[PDB]
């Protein structure tokens, strides 16, 4: 099924011809456009007062990366390197060895944030909910080097944003 868009004929009676002549000589559709713009003039604008007001986001929102801890303070990361394997941009670099107590932990965990595409594949692949994409998006820098995160930076991000991250995960973990 289909329809035509430009297949209507104008009536040739004197009434319609006079109306079209008045439209041509008196610019009625131009006045209609002016009226629409004037109508929009008196409407309330859609602008928000950033940074005092913020755009709405979701618990699913993907922001700055962070490394999480268990409630005892133990690192959740077990150096399984699933996030490194799945990372479509090869932004994750991981090295590991047995810790002084024999635990499986990382010694290097870097995310090149200028290689990252913020796809969230890494937090999907993580089996222990160790690497997540946080709610923060305001972390612009002045130098390129500051966007090359090592394990200390990601652990500090986790320690700093865990209060929001745990609540965001609590609201969405039943969809995952």
């Amino acid at each position: 099924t289909y329809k035509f868009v430009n297949m209507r004929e104008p009536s040739m009676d004197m009434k319609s011809v006079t109306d079209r002549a008045a439209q041509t000589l008196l610019w009625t559709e131009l006045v209609r456009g002016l009226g629409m713009t004037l109508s929009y003039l008196f409407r309330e604008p859609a602008t928000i007062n950033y940074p005092f007001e913020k755009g709405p986001l979701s618990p699913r929102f993907r922001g700055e990366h962070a490394l999480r801890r268990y409630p005892s303070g133990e690192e959740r990361c077990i150096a399984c390197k699933l996030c490194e394997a799945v990372c479509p941009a090869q932004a994750i670099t991981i090295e590991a060895e047995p810790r002084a107590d024999g635990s499986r932990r990382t010694t290097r965990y870097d995310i090149d944030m200028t290689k990252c595409i913020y796809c969230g594949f890494c937090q999907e692949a993580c089996p222990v909910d160790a690497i997540v994409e946080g709610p923060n998006f305001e972390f612009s820098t002045e130098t390129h080097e500051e966007l090359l995160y090592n394990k200390e930076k990601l652990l500090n991000n986790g320690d700093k944003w865990e209060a929001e991250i745990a609540a965001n995960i609590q609201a969405d973990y039943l969809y995952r």
């Binding site: 394997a85 090869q90 670099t93 090149d112």
Partner: protein, 208 residues
Amino acid sequence: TRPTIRPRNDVVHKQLSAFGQYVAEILPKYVQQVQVSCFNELEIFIHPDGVIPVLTFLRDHTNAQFKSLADLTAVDVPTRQNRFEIVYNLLSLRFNSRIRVKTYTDELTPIESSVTVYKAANWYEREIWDMFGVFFANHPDLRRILTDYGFEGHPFRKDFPLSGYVELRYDDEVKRVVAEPVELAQEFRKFDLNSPWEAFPAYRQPPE
């Protein structure tokens, strides 16, 4: 079967097999093989000399009426004596059908240009030349389309390195952008993903 398995369509399968038999009968001089895939896609393999007659027949014949060239591309298989597989994808609006025509060439054998059959083939042939190095004879204006000016090599060949050979930066002494051999601060990490166990017995090859 049912919920998770893709359903079959035998009617389209028989129709495409019959039309492939039809085309093979009409053009025995060029057609070498006709295949129908299990998801109902018809493929016709031709000799390189038959590029123009076969496409013209498929476009102009009353029973074919493939008036639209959907896509034209190349595939690089280094293990073959004829390296480059040239793929034509056609669409018929009269019969609501699609067809694929495939031929082959190597690095030094030209392929006839199809701009006389399909005007769309101009930029597709330009891209094939740019990416694979396949020359098209009688092309009205053949030149690079996608690569930088003065770019050497054909990137889409399997033996071309992923990061290429040269990289760009701005040099202050000469006050211009220069090209230098590639150095990567981090090397791309090659992953060996293939499982040592066979996945699909239906495609097992003879052990030679």
